[PDB]
Design a protein around this nucleic acid. Structure first.
Ligand SMILES: Nc1ncnc2c1ncn2[C@@H]1O[C@H](COP(=O)(O)OP(=O)(O)O)[C@@H](O)[C@H]1O
Ligand SMILES: Nc1ncnc2c1ncn2[C@@H]1O[C@H](COP(=O)(O)OP(=O)(O)O)[C@@H](O)[C@H]1O
Ligand SMILES: [Mg+2]
Ligand SMILES: [Mg+2]
Lengths: 95, 449, 109, 88, 96, 95, 88, 108, 96, 449
DNA sequence: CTGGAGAATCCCGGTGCCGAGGCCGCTCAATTGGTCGTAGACAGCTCTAGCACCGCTTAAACGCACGTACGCGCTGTCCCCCGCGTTTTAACCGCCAAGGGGATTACTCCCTAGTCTCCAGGCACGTGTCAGATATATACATCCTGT
DNA sequence: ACAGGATGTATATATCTGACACGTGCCTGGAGACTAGGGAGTAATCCCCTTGGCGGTTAAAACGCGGGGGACAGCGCGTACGTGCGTTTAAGCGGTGCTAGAGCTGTCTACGACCAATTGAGCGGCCTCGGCACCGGGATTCTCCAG
């Protein structure tokens, strides 16, 4: 038994949209946050709640950018998102 | 009732004291020095509670994972009339055992690890238990730990602690054990404070201790040697750059960037053990091995004393460490030497652990070195065969080390056990050894009853 | 002196008139603040509070819960055309995404 | 060699392909090209740089070595990225 | 401990029970509700302050807060918020 | 003679991208501003520069929207602007 | 009839097609569809409504019957449409 | 009383330190305001002013005209990446669009 | 009778002459420069005000302006500007 | 030298006075009452300056557009030795005339309109002029006008003003004319103030005026009749709704919306003239119907007095109005009556204007009504044939009306001219007529020299 | 491919003009100098919470291979833009005329901030208990295949 | 076209756990009630600037319609993305110990705001010779088409 291409994916669009959880693993993100900050100032410490504010803000930003990317893909009559659709969304938003 | 052999007179007196606690209706602590055969005193108590009081009811034992196969073996050996069962394994195996063995109620002793209890807590609270034995009871010293909370929710007619290090760091960590045994007596730590020259007054009713130096005059006493070592020139370089906090080191170019140091003490401790623990420190990305590695660590330069030992009869040795990577570099050294060895660690699966212990202990066994991580390998396992102990690292808690040494100094040890402790001379390893000794003073290894 | 009555009780409000007056006086908005300014502002903040909690409580009820949680609040704000304009640039934590799948994407029939 | 068994990736790689796919599924994306995964990492890194640089400017001004939750909330607010839930 | 922390939480709960007597609310949701009240307060007082300055006045009055509400809120919320503010100020003035 | 379709469109782009004049006629826009306003309040008079401030802001907004709209049509592999390209640009902007 | 010779259009129609075409050309548009004129008028009217409504709120607050250049500049500023040249 | 010396002369600036202090004091920015604050702010306002007018002057000479006009200012701000980031949400009156066609639209 | 209106025009003129001695400027370009100076003054002063409230201080000082400048200005503009302002305070405090 | 006919004794005396101004080196104003042949007194002066002083140099005349073809005709008739040329037409025609006629320098008088001067100002400033004659000089009364500025930049040996309404609204307006003539005498209006019972002292040196009542005893004096009229019921309705400002009226539904009234005075003035000027007011979108037009306007109800006049010999009539739409409704009324008529307005082309005037003035002409707009048709044109004048509207400035009446009362009028002025009784038209009469008092129609 | 013709801005030199820089006068906000009182620097202390390591469990991600929906290059198609000229209407600019209403200054007197004093709302605190969680079970959905 | 087979999804019931919910004790911002002195409001004055609309003149909008550009549907082709297997991996959760550095209280003294007094930068008013808009002369040089 194999489901047809595209049916498992729609099931997923439905699950993740219902849930409210964070999707990136948390240890991996904390390490990136800490590496980016070493460039600006050295030897900083971080409240446990401060990295969670960064992760909530980051995942909210990426989910919203993926909506604009999918409308720019469907405008060009495709269902597959591509790097050019991300770039047009970021240009029309002025960033 | 006890079949395969005889309890020594102190084991007989300990049994009579445990029976007297039961008949007086009290719980208590059995805390003989390590290597005094505490295990058999407990197995004999359960035989009594069945053969003489007619109580075949359920009893529980909690143990560290590395000792689950010893306890089971001993039940099978000395008192075969008890019906012991053991919980361990993957989710399917635990579900199958619960369904097909535990709930049927065809057994009288249940043996488990602390993780298996934390997983199956909702199953085990169904039963009403007659005895709850915890081993290495120092594990529950912090009352806010999840095991300590879970363990106080059980229905139990009787409670028992077995530990040879009843004192650990402070009087609150001992009160936390008394509050499991008699919560209605030691109502608070603020009440234990003040009660406290009040030596043995509170303790004698609920504690019994005997020392090998009194009760086993035939066992040879330990010999202890500190070996102070200098740093290598490479270690002296890194130890100074770490203090300055200009380690730099970046494998992805960026002119070496900077390594972050929010905790410098751990970086200094790593360095003392070996420079290669750090990134990019080994010379030559190909790696190469050979004596270049040996020449860069002041501890390893001295560790070639293993060659004298091997030639000096079978002075088989145990090596203890606190860092998992150090066992890696010691294992590459032993493989490059072509030595015969064993290794136990926290990563090891359960089945493998007991096979290793057995293979090393056989009467005709050829393994010279056993490498043990200090947390997983330092508790319960018995290895009377080896004559020597090496402590490569030093722990903030003095009691952790003491236990590790006693893996060898135990009943059945025919020969004097030598303990070698490595210390880098002008470094933070001095302060660590000084504080551990400051903590010994308040304990004083009280002999007690 | 006479026994105290809160200024919120005089205005017929649940939010605090006194705290609001202090906040305004110490926030460096103007060198003077009027007596009716804190009462008008407390009325508006309580009205806007009630508008959100009415929609959030309906969302909790439809989901069969007795307790409002951060997801119920998102659903309320984003399904109301004025609250979603008032709050178009705020991120609510543990607030999900309204469910929407574009039509082109769905299976054929 | 026991000593070299483990190998380390860059910290950007910790944002895995499975982690990006779920975010696009919450956004309602059905199918994704394979070059979108490196493009997304570049975009997040630019977002984190701009928020963190400011959160550290606030921390330095207060003469503290610890970044707090309020330092992050004020930086997001100043850029039009208001966040509720973490105080303020 | 040794330091108090003011919040709107008790006021949000007193209104909750008038709107829905049966329901309760979580601590995470109450923290979002405290953030909403703080954000809206800072918006309305920023427009009021500016209005006074443009017109060269020293005082913020209810007439400046009424205009700030009309500049900030969408049309159906603005007409109701102005009705609730004017009802409160009339009632307050009758007791004063 | 006849130039070819689109040749004079390029001269017009260049000519209007050099000059800074207002392109909409002034008197017709003044009547538009006044009608919209009579719904918000009646009998308003107006400063002459207040109408020029409204025209400058209005032509600046439309020119910028037509640039975002053109990018969208090129993205869809076309050269002619369509009503759906204005709608995509406004939607992605957040209007 | 001399009396009825002239006929009046709506005021939106005053924005003619020749003019929309020029504002597209300043924006670099080469070719335009015939439906855009209706669409562009709808879009400008929504822009003028939102700016004027606020410019009149400011005028009423000042108790004046004349809309000034400053009333327009403050309304554009409050919406993120800052304008230089007309004062302020 | 000694001869007066205006605070801008003491700091070596052309913009007015005294006026900036009044504007800050009466503008509701803080309960108090320090004496070094108007000096720092006047220096930054004069630097940013000189940064624009320098490039505006060059755009005027490129057009061969002696007076700066409002288009010259637009050509300067838009052609510099940092001034265009500082002034990214601003419209300038009598300001044209920088000359530009997407290459897709140019003839073969 | 007719009241005075303040502007930056005479300082803008004196700075132009220092940069390009022979160049002039039209009255409309002056209105735009006067608008620019006021926009940038209001941005810096608004950030400097908040930073003090966040840290619970009642005084605006050169340190709060320095942080405000680093938050608002782009990267290279910020560097040169910071140098110009710290230079001006160094010269002023030598001659106060 | 003058050929076609003989000047009258007052024209002879006026010529001798203009010559005496030239020989004294002064400029001056000729301001005889309208209808007194100022045009010929001027043409005769130029003939003198050529035949007796030997000055054939360039001379300029500025005129209203509607009189350019009269002036030219008169030059051709009385003094054929002057070489007069005329500038008028599209850009190509002006370029062709400048290139092929003006710059050649084969002419001695140049005749132009005020618009043609403002267009060709840079061409005409090349030449050095001997005389600059402005006619209807009241046009330059505001010194801040463009024409007034442009006109003071010319190189001119002599200047001259012709006007029959030398006073208009105030003493500054008259100073503005003196400052063109002798700018070095009347240096300022603050100096003319104070100089001012100072009647004729300043004026006599530089002004001459004669009145028809003194110098043409044979011309019949005017008869003036006010006719007060009530509003129609429809006008009474609109006049009340306009005052309330609840006009409503919206053709695109919207429940009639509201109409904007930033100036109510002009709305009230419109209504008095006719209700149909307003939108949606004429009953029935088809329109077509006609007797209803006469009824819904109190002025039009009375205007059927045109039927008595036509039957009462050829009392041919001129109708003056200030609103162009009113000539529309009067033209539809005349077309629906099948009357014979002419119309002149501001939108008429130049060629057509003079044809109309000629057709109406012919000895055997059959046209009964001439419709004239008051600002274009009210100045310069001569129409001695008509016996009657109707003023449908009333102007704020009294002098505008006076001129319009005089289009008929002039040399060559054989019969008494009747003037009828319509006034709606209880409306703002009362206040307009009262204000215009308040301004007449300060002028007083001074006879002067 | 490409010569040729012929409409496109493009320099060039003259002509006039009200924009911009100069100065005048004199207005009213900056600076000197003194004084007051309290923001904030600073030293010290306490003790919370942020950092490392390992032990142990098992969700999770890794890579492999399989096979199909859909990415995107050519072609034909035939509608609706672009460009021209024509005729046509209304925008721009100049003109006068009136009087709405921005603006000034002046007067008077309601409003709010200040102070001190006072006692009850709101803070954190600690504890019982019930919405919520999730375990097992099944019943009904919807997808997929092959015939 | 649509029969069973297979799968994930729904919800029924059970017991279970840990965030909410009450009330307690406690203490510091809100509230009383006068005096203070300015902002604010309202009168009245003056005269800047906005609303009509004719007259005249050009320019820009409008109409119509020849003709070739681009929009768009369809086909076929082919490799890049979905899917599921088994596999290996590190995130997570717990636990130990240490000590950096957030936080507080009590103390002391540089700083800024304030006042009154004096004087000069900066305001508006009145000015004018020179920047550069404009017109009408010729210069290449854009583009296009029929040889
Ligand atoms: N009575 C006894 N007879 C023989 N051997 C004994 C006896 N008691 C203890 N031992 C030996 O002690 C060793 C382990 O002792 P153990 O029970 O682990 O001590 P503890 O539990 O105190 O660490 C076993 O190898 C066993 O042979
Ligand atoms: N001396 C005269 N002889 C014959 N006809 C004359 C004489 N003077 C004037 N007219 C006629 O009287 C008419 C009015 O003259 P006009 O120049 O229009 O006077 P004004 O210009 O002062 O109104 C002219 O048409 C002219 O033909
Ligand atoms: Mg043991
Ligand atoms: Mg005449």
């Amino acid at each position: 038994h194999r489901y047809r291409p595209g049916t498992v994916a729609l099931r997923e669009i439905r699950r993740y949209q219902k849930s409210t959880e964070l999707l990136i693993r948390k240890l991996p993100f904390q390490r990136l946050v800490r590496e980016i900050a070493q460039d600006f100032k050295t030897d900083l410490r971080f409240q446990s709640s401060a990295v969670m504010a960064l992760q909530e803000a980051s995942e909210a930003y990426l989910v919203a950018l993926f909506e604009d990317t999918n409308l720019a893909a469907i405008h060009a009559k495709r269902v597959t998102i591509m790097p050019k659709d991300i770039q047009l969304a970021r240009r029309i938003r002025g960033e | 009732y006890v079949k395969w052999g005889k309890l020594r007179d102190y084991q007989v007196r300990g049994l009579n004291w445990l029976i007297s606690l039961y008949e007086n209706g009290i719980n208590g602590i059995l805390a003989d020095e390590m290597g005094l055969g505490k295990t058999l005193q407990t197995i004999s108590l359960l035989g009594y509670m069945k053969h003489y009081r007619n109580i075949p009811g359920p009893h529980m034992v909690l143990v560290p994972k590395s000792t689950l196969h010893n306890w089971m073996s001993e039940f099978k050996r000395w008192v075969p009339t008890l019906r012991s069962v053991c919980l361990i394994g993957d989710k399917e195996q635990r579900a199958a055992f619960v369904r097909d063995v535990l709930l049927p109620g065809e057994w009288d002793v249940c043996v488990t690890s602390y993780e298996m209890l934390i997983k199956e807590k909702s199953v085990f609270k169904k039963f009403n238990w007659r005895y709850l034995v915890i081993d290495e009871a120092h594990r529950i010293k912090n009352e806010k730990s999840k095991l300590s909370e879970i363990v106080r929710e059980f229905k139990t007619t009787n409670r028992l602690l077995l530990t040879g290090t009843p004192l650990q760091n402070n009087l609150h960590e001992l009160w936390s054990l008394l509050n499991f045994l008699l919560p209605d007596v030691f109502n608070s730590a603020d009440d234990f404070d003040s009660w406290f020259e009040r030596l043995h007054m509170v303790l004698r009713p609920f504690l019994l201790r005997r020392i090998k130096a009194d009760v086993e005059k035939s066992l040879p006493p330990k010999k202890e040697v500190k070996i102070y070592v200098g740093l290598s020139k490479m270690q002296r370089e890194w130890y100074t750059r770490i203090l300055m906090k200009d380690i730099d080191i970046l494998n992805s170019a960026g002119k070496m960037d900077k390594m972050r140091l929010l905790n410098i003490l751990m970086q200094l401790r790593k360095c003392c053990n070996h420079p290669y623990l750090f990134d990019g420190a080994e010379p030559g990305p190909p790696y190469t091995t050979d004596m270049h590695l040996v020449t860069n660590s002041g501890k390893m330069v001295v560790l070639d004393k293993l060659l004298p030992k091997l030639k000096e009869q079978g002075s088989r040795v145990l090596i203890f460490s606190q860092m998992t990577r150090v066992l890696d570099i010691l294992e590459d050294y032993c493989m490059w030497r072509n030595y015969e060895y064993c290794r136990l660690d926290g990563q090891t699966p359960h089945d493998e652990r007991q096979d290793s212990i057995n293979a090393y202990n056989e009467p005709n066994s050829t393994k010279f070195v056993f490498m043990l991580s200090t947390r997983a390998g330092g508790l319960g396992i018995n290895l009377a065969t080896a004559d020597v102990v090496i402590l490569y690292d030093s722990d903030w808690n003095p009691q952790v080390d003491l236990q590790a040494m006693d893996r060898a100094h135990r009943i059945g040890q025919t020969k004097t056990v030598r303990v070698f402790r490595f210390i880098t001379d002008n470094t933070v390893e001095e302060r660590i050894v000084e504080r551990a000794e400051m903590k010994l003073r308040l304990d004083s290894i009280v002999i007690q009853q | 002196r006479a026994k105290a009555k809160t200024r919120s009780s005089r205005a017929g409000l649940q939010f605090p008139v006194g705290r609001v007056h202090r906040l305004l006086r110490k926030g460096n908005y103007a060198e003077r603040v009027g007596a009716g300014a804190p009462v008008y502002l407390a009325a508006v903040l309580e009205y806007l509070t009630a508008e959100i909690l009415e929609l959030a409580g309906n969302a909790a009820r439809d989901n069969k819960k007795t307790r409002i949680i951060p997801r119920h609040l998102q659903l309320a704000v984003r399904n109301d055309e004025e609250l979603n304009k008032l709050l178009g640039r705020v991120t609510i934590a543990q607030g999900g995404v309204l469910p929407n799948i574009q039509s082109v994407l769905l299976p054929k029939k | 060699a026991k000593r070299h068994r483990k190998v380390l990736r860059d910290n950007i790689q910790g944002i895995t392909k499975p982690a990006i796919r779920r975010l696009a599924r919450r956004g309602g994306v059905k199918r994704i090209s394979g070059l979108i995964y490196e493009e997304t990492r570049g975009v997040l890194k630019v977002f984190l740089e701009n928020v963190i640089r400011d959160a550290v400017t606030y921390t330095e001004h207060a003469k503290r070595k610890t970044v707090t939750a309020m330092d992050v909330v004020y930086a997001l607010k100043r850029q039009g990225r208001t966040l509720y839930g973490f105080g303020g | 401990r040794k330091t108090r922390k003011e919040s709107y939480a008790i006021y949000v709960y007193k209104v909750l029970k008038q709107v829905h007597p049966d329901t309760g609310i979580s601590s995470k949701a109450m923290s979002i509700m405290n953030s909403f009240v703080n954000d809206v307060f800072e918006r309305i007082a920023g427009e009021a302050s500016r209005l006074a300055h443009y017109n060269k006045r020293s005082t913020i009055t209810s007439r400046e807060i009424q205009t700030a509400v009309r500049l900030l809120l969408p049309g159906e919320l603005a007409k109701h918020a102005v009705s609730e503010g004017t009802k409160a100020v009339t009632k307050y003035t009758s007791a004063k």
